[PDB]
Amino acid sequence: HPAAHGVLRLVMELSGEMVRKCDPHIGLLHRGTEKLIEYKTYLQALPYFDRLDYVSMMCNEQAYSLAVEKLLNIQPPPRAQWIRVLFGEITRLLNHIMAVTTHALDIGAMTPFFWMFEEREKMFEFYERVSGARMHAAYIRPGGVHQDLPLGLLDDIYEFSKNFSFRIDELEEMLTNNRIWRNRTVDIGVVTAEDALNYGFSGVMLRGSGIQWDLRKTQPYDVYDQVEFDVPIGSRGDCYDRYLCRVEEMRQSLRIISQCLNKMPPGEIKVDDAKVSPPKRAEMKTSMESLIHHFKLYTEGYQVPPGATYTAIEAPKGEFGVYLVSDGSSRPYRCKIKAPGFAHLAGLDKMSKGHMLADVVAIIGTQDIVFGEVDR
Amino acid sequence: LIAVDEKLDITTLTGVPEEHIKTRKVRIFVPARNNMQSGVNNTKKWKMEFDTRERWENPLMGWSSTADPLSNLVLTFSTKEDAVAFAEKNGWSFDVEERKVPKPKSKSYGANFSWNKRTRVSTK
Amino acid sequence: TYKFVNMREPSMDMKSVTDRAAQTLLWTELVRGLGMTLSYLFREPATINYPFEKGPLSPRFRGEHALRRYPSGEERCIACKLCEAVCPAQAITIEAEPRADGSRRTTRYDIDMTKCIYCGFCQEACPVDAIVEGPNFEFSTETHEELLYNKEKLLNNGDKWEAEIAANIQADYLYR
Amino acid sequence: GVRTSPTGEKVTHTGQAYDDGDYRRVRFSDRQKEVNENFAIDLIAEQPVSEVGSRVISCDGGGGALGHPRVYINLDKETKTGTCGYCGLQFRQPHH
Amino acid sequence: LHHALIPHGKGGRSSVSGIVATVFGATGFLGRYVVNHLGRMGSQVIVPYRCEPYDTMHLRPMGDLGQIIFMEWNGKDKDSIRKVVEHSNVVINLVGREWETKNFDFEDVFVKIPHAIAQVSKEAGVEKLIHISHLNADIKSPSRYLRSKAVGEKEVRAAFPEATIIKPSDIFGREDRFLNYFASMRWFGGVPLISLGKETVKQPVYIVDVSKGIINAIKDPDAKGKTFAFVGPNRYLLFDLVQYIFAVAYRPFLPYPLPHFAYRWVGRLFEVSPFEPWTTRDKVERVHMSDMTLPHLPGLEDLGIQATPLELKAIEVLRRHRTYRWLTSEMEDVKPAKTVN
Amino acid sequence: EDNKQFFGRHRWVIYTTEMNGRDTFWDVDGSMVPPEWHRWLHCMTDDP
Amino acid sequence: TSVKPIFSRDMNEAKRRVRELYRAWYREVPNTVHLFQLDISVKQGRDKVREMFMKNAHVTDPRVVDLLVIKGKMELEETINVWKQRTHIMRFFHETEAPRPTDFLSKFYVGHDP
Amino acid sequence: ASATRVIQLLRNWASGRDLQAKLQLRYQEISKRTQPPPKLPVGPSHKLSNNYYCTRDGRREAMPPSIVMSSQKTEKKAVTPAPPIKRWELSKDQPYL
Amino acid sequence: LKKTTGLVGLAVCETPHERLKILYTKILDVLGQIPKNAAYRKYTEQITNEKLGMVKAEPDVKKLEEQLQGGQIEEVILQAENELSLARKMLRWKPWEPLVEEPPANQWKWPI
Amino acid sequence: TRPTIRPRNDVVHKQLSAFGQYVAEILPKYVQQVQVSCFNELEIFIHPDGVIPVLTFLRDHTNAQFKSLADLTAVDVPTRQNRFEIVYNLLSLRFNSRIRVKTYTDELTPIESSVTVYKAANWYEREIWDMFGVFFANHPDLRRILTDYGFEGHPFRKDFPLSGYVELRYDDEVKRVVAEPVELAQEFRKFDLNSPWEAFPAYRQPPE
Ligand SMILES: CCCCCCCCCCCCCCCCC[C@@H](O)O[C@H](CO[C@H](O)CCCCCCCCCCCCCCC)COP(=O)(O)OCC[N+](C)(C)C
Ligand SMILES: CCCCCCCC/C=C\CCCCCCCC(=O)OC[C@H](COP(=O)(O)OCCN)OC(=O)CCCCCCC/C=C\CCCCCCCC
Ligand SMILES: NC(=O)C1=CN([C@@H]2O[C@H](COP(=O)(O)OP(=O)(O)OC[C@H]3O[C@@H](n4cnc5c(N)ncnc54)[C@H](OP(=O)(O)O)[C@@H]3O)[C@@H](O)[C@H]2O)C=CC1
Ligand SMILES: CN(C)C(=N)NC(=N)N
Ligand code: SF4
Ligand code: SF4
Ligand SMILES: [Zn+2]
């Protein structure tokens, strides 16, 4: 089905066109990411996270890098942290664009989809410039980032950020006060605060339900404590409120992008520890110890002290978490991936009580499910 | 609330095919130290590996193909008793080799310059 | 800090009541949406004329793989198998032996392009810049078998794209 | 230079050539066998021998950071030329 | 055996069975089944095709990478035949059409082409040749189809003395002619039968059984220069067979006797179609002809295959011809037809 | 090249009518360009 | 003592659960054949159910019996709701597997299998 | 860009915003594709003295988790995982949309 | 007084202080059936007496919310109800008894 | 200033230790061990039958309002007698904190389902069952969630091969997808990566 987001067998019990029960069948995109991570090294497990939520790639990479760095008891350099935050907010803009435009497409509107996907094309150009791949950069790595920014990336990002608020305003002009969209998305899939908390909803779901909670504000990571932004809060907990929250999150991400561009510091882009991050090419080709460390890091990898950690970040779709268990070897012993969409899709059945088929499509859109991260 | 005298058997629950349950003779052992290195950190924990099966050459690209699902499966156990218990409760056959721990050696630098013994070295 | 997205109650003065009633009857916001769509119609399209126009790329772009050579013509690879050991998808198979002149070269070097994830770890782990991810990205095929490259195919690709690969390496290597 | 097998099939630089009675030659019918003409061993043999007046020399493959890791060749053996094995380049002390 | 022809693996999709087979006319019913069986074994298969490459797309998923190779050949081109049979130790011949076209006739597709394939196969030194003939291959049959079949069988035996000649009775399956031809007479009102079909006896053979017999004939060491007759387990009168076909299809059955000359005229009318004809005069003759009994020839039970009865597999074919009313009806609902034993 | 066009359409190519042995009057591929002009067209650099 | 049982405690009640599950499967083969448009007979389906039940006849641990009947009930409820397709129901029959010989001479002929 | 004066006014009044002020297409305002060579910094640990890896070993400072209480081995005030979080202050930039 | 609490499904309570006093009194009554030496009883009774003192001392709602440091009054009431349910369940569970059973020999060892 | 080494939080460590002592005192019947990792992550190891009491306490207690179930997973450790290790991650929004609760079980011993405490536990325990084989006693609907219909065996167990036992393909003879024993074109190349030299002496296990 076009409205199934690719792979979703929703077994619906309709009585006419009302919905009696929804039984989401998932696993059609289950590959075995956790088993493969168990069988792969720490460096080789990064692209797996890069492909979990294939709409927030830098966010997944940042979560994995934070987990591994916490286990390694190291600290990325400030410039690397600032680049991480900047590209995380760029990825948040990408993800919110995708979510809003896909929801509007499911409802029936497509012109904002095309406009904001042209914008997504520009942001993918930024991704390809910084890393070399349009979608799966594999740029954020444990211990910092891979390479430094090119000598025009900041200027081009500034130009894009300067010419994007008009695009957001154009998107709002088509849906925000439109009566058809308001009828489609108002008082649809209302979820109470206590129900959201118990079912484990996170991020935009909680904010729409009214919960004043944001990971970036409550448990800051990287340099998120060094930037100022506002957290949108809903009042009614419906699709329209969640859409407004996502648009305001786009605007606040523009704020954070401007702050990062103004406050970017100089220095290195990875931890100055050749036993964790590989040395530069010149050092590798001239220094014996650097060559040894490069060889060992790219063949065996870096050991991680034994222990279990659970780190979570405010990914654009909610709380994205990694529970990593290491036994002192160079490859992870266990890696559980808490995707934000898993609990939301579990709670899809509750939200679709008394609604119709179109309302169920709208509820799926407002839940913003990516089945790559749902199935893992 | 039942007794625990009876042996445990999970073959009917693991889902392994009867062929790979009956015709498999795993090996329990502490891995031999890699003779190319003097480190002994890999001779601490017991291993459990399966018997080697047929490997042929792919008609195209000449790659090494296999038909044994458990070819790469190697389990790590803290002790021989744990390894044996796991093998018994999973129903495979097992062959257990005891650990080979080096015996103490009496080293003395003064013996390299013995007055009359043959241990005297001719060079340094 | 937090902000309320939707907590603004409407006014109730007669002027605003009449304005809202006129909006309800005369579809003002619908006409506004029509005007926005008409403006986008009268704007200029952002479509390039492929294949006569190609989208922008970067010197760091990672596309079709290749094996490079020294200026003397000798192969760069020394069969160190770092790319094979670091490949996340295990798409590289390497088999080597001493050459007739005693050089440490490769006899088998296979990349399964249907198994590669195009991540660039092989070119970053290469100590002699032998394996590279070249700029070519239009190498689609009608059959599966042709996407299983070997040493001869990769050397041919390197010879064909040597100039552009060298230019990209020159432009990017200072960041590495 | 590409050499021809007794069955007319081009031979690669690694000595690969299907046997006359090998069925796998059927894949090349109506198609071509991918063989590169340039041979690295032939080219490096065609390369000359550098002659420097020092017992120890350094080779990095040329270009600086764009070459291979730098190694040192000891040109004390006068009966043969010291060969940097990363790039296969020969060096030798002047006999004159 | 060559080092590359030694069998390996556990007989799977990625195994090596040591069989390199060129399957002529593989773009058909028996051709597709045989190619699928060879690919399932894990053999090297060469499929010479003269049609559009689109019509040969269904053969791609039947083998692993590098196992199915498609080459273009012409029927009257010994150079192309040699090109496609140069590197194979098994050659399978299934070429044949039930109608005569403007360029190819029964003589051409059943005598000249099989003889050329056998002759070129001997020149290339192939170890095994399998050739498909018909059970009712009579030198003086009323059907030119069977006449040319017998002539070509003799020519193939003369050209390649070490051949295995399979003589199936009649193939029924999903893509078959037999059951589909009998069940497609719903449109033309009633069902015309010659002498009400009380004089014709047939024992059809299952397509999977024929394919497995062809496969085992390759692997059988002592079937080098033999002749096999593939027949089903039960012999049916034509009237009872058609009645059972219509009962399984759940369609009204109205059989009426049509005189032989009128049926011949009708077959003459239907063969004027430039496309594949619905029926021909020779098709009518073959339908009317009874299946000959050849007890001296070996069969499926001798090769090692148990014959599959019609009743078990009659619902795979005829379920498509039903309507929505009877689509969900089970196989056990219709009683088996009376046999002649 | 025409710098007055927006970025992306400021450089274009008209393919040859005959390359090697293929009559490319209509069927034109995106990879017919040599590597250097490929780089220039894809804008990895600025100097042709 | 002190060992937590999954269900039914002793072996007699576990056998009762097995019989209940067998009855439930037995009264479902005609519906499975009708709904999925299978080419098999109802008798063949009942025989296959009997075979799949009998391949665990050596189990003597009540907890293993309870887990087996739990999994069987899960598979039964997957079939009734038509969550499975014809593909899985026919996967129960191995209709395309090549006959692997079990005699020593043939196994020696074919390959290195034990 | 390149548009007729009539079309510019038509779009501007139809859209309600000055489109030429913030165009959605790039016209020579982007960075040049060819840039001067860069020089990345070295880092904090590229010193030639007073730099022993023992004093900057992040991995080796990790310790096994502290055992607060194990079963194997006044009036205390009840405690909490952390002091209660403070109420969020309403935004001053845009308190209400 | 306030129109909305800002949380979906959290209705405004017109009688905060009476409901808080009743809930805390019920909780204290439940805790009287728990053994004196039980560690659970002392802590929750202490925190309830600390919280019950504030409501009986400050009639202003906003200052009461500020001093309780538990969010809005409706959230405090919900927490009190959850605590009452938990106290009843604990009286049913009786978790002040000694440990049920020590783990196996080396159960929590890591790495292993 | 040691830019390479991550900073440490003694204050948060002390707070977590105090709260661990508090919960251990409150629930001595089930809580067996309390640990605080060096990166400030409180961890509680309890008896398997205490799941419902401990989780209900940590969810509804006034001083511990862990109203959000962050995650629920399991870890397979074949050497241990109770191989499966059920892990609950809880988040307290009121106190802005996180906690972890770990229980142990094996293939046959059931663990009481926590769906009556957290609703996400429904799908989380379905996933745990489908991946490891741990059966949860009182569950509204327990069945496979991620694996294929009719899939045999539990994939995430450490004794389960990476490539599985069967593969899928389309067989034209039967006009349907068929399942056949796995047969890889290229075998997965297992790499022995562990170095024979001890890395971290701090974690050295005593030779007894
Ligand atoms: C009721 C009667 C039927 C009504 C419905 C049918 C009506 C048909 C009317 C005629 C249709 C005109 C079709 C011809 C258009 C050809 C255009 C030309 O470009 O064809 C090229 C040449 O193609 C072939 O050489 C010929 C195409 C068909 C030419 C006409 C065929 C005969 C027409 C009359 C047939 C009989 C008509 C009556 C019976 C229908 C193909 O270009 P192509 O390579 O792809 O493009 C490459 C990509 N580019 C654009 C970037 C370069
Ligand atoms: C010739 C063709 C003209 C084409 C006109 C094009 C108009 C613009 C085209 C875009 C419109 C297409 C999409 C419209 C779909 C939605 C339109 C719509 O909803 O209108 C209905 C909307 C009410 O719906 P809701 O407000 O959503 O109700 C729920 C409230 N919560 O309003 C209407 O009912 C429209 C009714 C027409 C208004 C008539 C007013 C005129 C009355 C005064 C006339 C007086 C005459 C007699 C007095 C004489 C005195 C001397
Ligand atoms: N099915 C039956 O009724 C029975 C058939 N047989 C025999 O078994 C064999 C296979 O039968 P079946 O599958 O039903 O027949 P098909 O008509 O379905 O298949 C014939 C095949 O031969 C090819 N072919 C036909 N004419 C020529 C030609 N002039 N030159 C080259 N290739 C040609 C066709 O390819 P393309 O599409 O490219 O033309 C096709 O792949 C035949 O020899 C037949 O006589 C025996 C007993 C019963
Ligand atoms: C594949 N993804 C992510 C979709 N949203 N797909 C869709 N058809 N809407
Ligand atoms: S790009 Fe990555 S996946 Fe592809 S061959 Fe290189 S290392 Fe392997
Ligand atoms: S990393 Fe480079 S030198 Fe080493 S084996 Fe790979 S291509 Fe050859
Ligand atoms: Zn050199």
PDB file of C-alpha atoms in Angstrom, chain B residues 4-122:
ATOM      1  CA  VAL B   4      15.646 -32.033  39.081  1.00  0.00           C
ATOM      2  CA  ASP B   5      17.210 -35.505  38.820  1.00  0.00           C
ATOM      3  CA  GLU B   6      16.293 -35.993  35.156  1.00  0.00           C
ATOM      4  CA  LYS B   7      18.657 -34.786  32.453  1.00  0.00           C
ATOM      5  CA  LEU B   8      17.790 -31.595  30.595  1.00  0.00           C
ATOM      6  CA  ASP B   9      17.127 -31.688  26.852  1.00  0.00           C
ATOM      7  CA  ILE B  10      16.292 -28.690  24.651  1.00  0.00           C
ATOM      8  CA  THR B  11      16.819 -30.253  21.213  1.00  0.00           C
ATOM      9  CA  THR B  12      13.091 -30.138  20.445  1.00  0.00           C
ATOM     10  CA  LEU B  13      13.040 -26.408  21.289  1.00  0.00           C
ATOM     11  CA  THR B  14      16.263 -25.033  19.788  1.00  0.00           C
ATOM     12  CA  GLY B  15      14.900 -25.646  16.280  1.00  0.00           C
ATOM     13  CA  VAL B  16      18.152 -27.188  15.015  1.00  0.00           C
ATOM     14  CA  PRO B  17      17.589 -29.825  12.296  1.00  0.00           C
ATOM     15  CA  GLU B  18      17.865 -33.465  13.317  1.00  0.00           C
ATOM     16  CA  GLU B  19      20.827 -33.918  10.960  1.00  0.00           C
ATOM     17  CA  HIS B  20      22.820 -31.190  12.729  1.00  0.00           C
ATOM     18  CA  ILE B  21      21.656 -32.499  16.109  1.00  0.00           C
ATOM     19  CA  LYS B  22      22.645 -36.147  15.602  1.00  0.00           C
ATOM     20  CA  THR B  23      25.693 -35.940  13.318  1.00  0.00           C
ATOM     21  CA  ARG B  24      27.593 -33.179  15.167  1.00  0.00           C
ATOM     22  CA  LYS B  25      30.552 -33.864  17.471  1.00  0.00           C
ATOM     23  CA  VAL B  26      31.720 -30.576  18.973  1.00  0.00           C
ATOM     24  CA  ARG B  27      35.166 -30.124  20.497  1.00  0.00           C
ATOM     25  CA  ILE B  28      35.665 -28.563  23.936  1.00  0.00           C
ATOM     26  CA  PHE B  29      39.163 -27.267  24.621  1.00  0.00           C
ATOM     27  CA  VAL B  30      41.290 -24.314  25.664  1.00  0.00           C
ATOM     28  CA  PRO B  31      42.784 -22.874  22.449  1.00  0.00           C
ATOM     29  CA  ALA B  32      46.463 -23.532  21.893  1.00  0.00           C
ATOM     30  CA  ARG B  33      48.645 -20.468  22.333  1.00  0.00           C
ATOM     31  CA  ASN B  34      49.574 -18.871  19.016  1.00  0.00           C
ATOM     32  CA  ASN B  35      53.183 -20.003  18.680  1.00  0.00           C
ATOM     33  CA  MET B  36      54.068 -16.836  16.734  1.00  0.00           C
ATOM     34  CA  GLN B  37      53.455 -14.689  19.839  1.00  0.00           C
ATOM     35  CA  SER B  38      54.357 -14.989  23.515  1.00  0.00           C
ATOM     36  CA  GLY B  39      51.046 -13.669  24.873  1.00  0.00           C
ATOM     37  CA  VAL B  40      48.805 -16.026  26.826  1.00  0.00           C
ATOM     38  CA  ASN B  41      45.655 -13.887  27.056  1.00  0.00           C
ATOM     39  CA  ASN B  42      43.885 -16.147  24.522  1.00  0.00           C
ATOM     40  CA  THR B  43      44.441 -19.319  26.588  1.00  0.00           C
ATOM     41  CA  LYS B  44      42.094 -18.380  29.439  1.00  0.00           C
ATOM     42  CA  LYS B  45      38.543 -19.314  28.394  1.00  0.00           C
ATOM     43  CA  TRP B  46      37.268 -22.643  27.095  1.00  0.00           C
ATOM     44  CA  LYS B  47      35.961 -22.901  23.541  1.00  0.00           C
ATOM     45  CA  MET B  48      33.350 -25.032  21.802  1.00  0.00           C
ATOM     46  CA  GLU B  49      33.653 -25.509  18.036  1.00  0.00           C
ATOM     47  CA  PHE B  50      32.070 -27.875  15.525  1.00  0.00           C
ATOM     48  CA  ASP B  51      33.607 -30.399  13.155  1.00  0.00           C
ATOM     49  CA  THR B  52      34.808 -29.170   9.770  1.00  0.00           C
ATOM     50  CA  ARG B  53      32.540 -29.937   6.804  1.00  0.00           C
ATOM     51  CA  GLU B  54      33.053 -29.861   3.042  1.00  0.00           C
ATOM     52  CA  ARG B  55      34.222 -26.694   1.288  1.00  0.00           C
ATOM     53  CA  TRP B  56      34.333 -26.551  -2.507  1.00  0.00           C
ATOM     54  CA  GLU B  57      35.192 -23.887  -5.080  1.00  0.00           C
ATOM     55  CA  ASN B  58      32.480 -21.758  -6.650  1.00  0.00           C
ATOM     56  CA  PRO B  59      32.076 -22.319 -10.417  1.00  0.00           C
ATOM     57  CA  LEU B  60      31.988 -18.530 -10.855  1.00  0.00           C
ATOM     58  CA  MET B  61      34.693 -16.352  -9.230  1.00  0.00           C
ATOM     59  CA  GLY B  62      36.244 -19.429  -7.585  1.00  0.00           C
ATOM     60  CA  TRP B  63      35.042 -18.538  -4.091  1.00  0.00           C
ATOM     61  CA  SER B  64      34.948 -21.046  -1.238  1.00  0.00           C
ATOM     62  CA  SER B  65      31.369 -22.235  -0.724  1.00  0.00           C
ATOM     63  CA  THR B  66      29.887 -24.166   2.179  1.00  0.00           C
ATOM     64  CA  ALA B  67      26.764 -26.055   3.212  1.00  0.00           C
ATOM     65  CA  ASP B  68      27.395 -26.236   6.977  1.00  0.00           C
ATOM     66  CA  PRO B  69      25.289 -23.690   8.912  1.00  0.00           C
ATOM     67  CA  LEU B  70      27.402 -24.014  12.078  1.00  0.00           C
ATOM     68  CA  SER B  71      30.799 -23.679  10.381  1.00  0.00           C
ATOM     69  CA  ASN B  72      31.703 -20.343  11.998  1.00  0.00           C
ATOM     70  CA  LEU B  73      29.948 -20.935  15.334  1.00  0.00           C
ATOM     71  CA  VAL B  74      32.446 -20.855  18.216  1.00  0.00           C
ATOM     72  CA  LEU B  75      31.165 -20.520  21.778  1.00  0.00           C
ATOM     73  CA  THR B  76      33.161 -19.236  24.748  1.00  0.00           C
ATOM     74  CA  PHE B  77      32.676 -20.779  28.194  1.00  0.00           C
ATOM     75  CA  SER B  78      34.258 -19.946  31.532  1.00  0.00           C
ATOM     76  CA  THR B  79      34.842 -23.581  32.502  1.00  0.00           C
ATOM     77  CA  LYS B  80      34.818 -27.132  31.189  1.00  0.00           C
ATOM     78  CA  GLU B  81      31.842 -28.044  33.375  1.00  0.00           C
ATOM     79  CA  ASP B  82      29.787 -25.197  31.900  1.00  0.00           C
ATOM     80  CA  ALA B  83      30.772 -26.188  28.361  1.00  0.00           C
ATOM     81  CA  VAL B  84      29.878 -29.842  28.986  1.00  0.00           C
ATOM     82  CA  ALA B  85      26.554 -28.903  30.582  1.00  0.00           C
ATOM     83  CA  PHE B  86      25.630 -26.672  27.641  1.00  0.00           C
ATOM     84  CA  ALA B  87      26.582 -29.365  25.120  1.00  0.00           C
ATOM     85  CA  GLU B  88      24.597 -32.016  27.003  1.00  0.00           C
ATOM     86  CA  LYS B  89      21.492 -29.844  27.308  1.00  0.00           C
ATOM     87  CA  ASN B  90      21.694 -28.978  23.600  1.00  0.00           C
ATOM     88  CA  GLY B  91      22.114 -32.645  22.659  1.00  0.00           C
ATOM     89  CA  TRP B  92      25.278 -32.505  20.552  1.00  0.00           C
ATOM     90  CA  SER B  93      28.089 -35.003  20.880  1.00  0.00           C
ATOM     91  CA  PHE B  94      31.224 -33.673  22.543  1.00  0.00           C
ATOM     92  CA  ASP B  95      34.914 -34.474  22.910  1.00  0.00           C
ATOM     93  CA  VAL B  96      36.668 -32.680  25.778  1.00  0.00           C
ATOM     94  CA  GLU B  97      40.420 -32.072  25.997  1.00  0.00           C
ATOM     95  CA  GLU B  98      41.960 -31.089  29.319  1.00  0.00           C
ATOM     96  CA  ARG B  99      43.909 -27.856  29.652  1.00  0.00           C
ATOM     97  CA  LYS B 100      47.633 -27.906  28.841  1.00  0.00           C
ATOM     98  CA  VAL B 101      49.282 -25.564  31.358  1.00  0.00           C
ATOM     99  CA  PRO B 102      53.082 -25.125  31.177  1.00  0.00           C
ATOM    100  CA  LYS B 103      55.058 -26.623  34.030  1.00  0.00           C
ATOM    101  CA  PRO B 104      57.293 -24.307  36.088  1.00  0.00           C
ATOM    102  CA  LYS B 105      60.861 -23.857  34.860  1.00  0.00           C
ATOM    103  CA  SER B 106      63.854 -23.011  37.054  1.00  0.00           C
ATOM    104  CA  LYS B 107      65.571 -20.033  35.420  1.00  0.00           C
ATOM    105  CA  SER B 108      68.853 -18.604  36.689  1.00  0.00           C
ATOM    106  CA  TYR B 109      71.087 -16.053  34.996  1.00  0.00           C
ATOM    107  CA  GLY B 110      74.114 -17.205  36.992  1.00  0.00           C
ATOM    108  CA  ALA B 111      74.000 -20.619  35.315  1.00  0.00           C
ATOM    109  CA  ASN B 112      75.148 -19.007  32.048  1.00  0.00           C
ATOM    110  CA  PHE B 113      78.650 -18.657  33.561  1.00  0.00           C
ATOM    111  CA  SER B 114      79.014 -21.994  35.320  1.00  0.00           C
ATOM    112  CA  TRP B 115      82.481 -23.008  36.480  1.00  0.00           C
ATOM    113  CA  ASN B 116      82.163 -26.600  35.238  1.00  0.00           C
ATOM    114  CA  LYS B 117      78.603 -27.293  34.051  1.00  0.00           C
ATOM    115  CA  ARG B 118      77.604 -27.442  30.390  1.00  0.00           C
ATOM    116  CA  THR B 119      75.011 -24.669  30.807  1.00  0.00           C
ATOM    117  CA  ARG B 120      77.731 -22.058  30.207  1.00  0.00           C
ATOM    118  CA  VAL B 121      76.938 -19.993  27.113  1.00  0.00           C
ATOM    119  CA  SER B 122      79.553 -19.238  24.469  1.00  0.00           C
TER     120      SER B 122
END
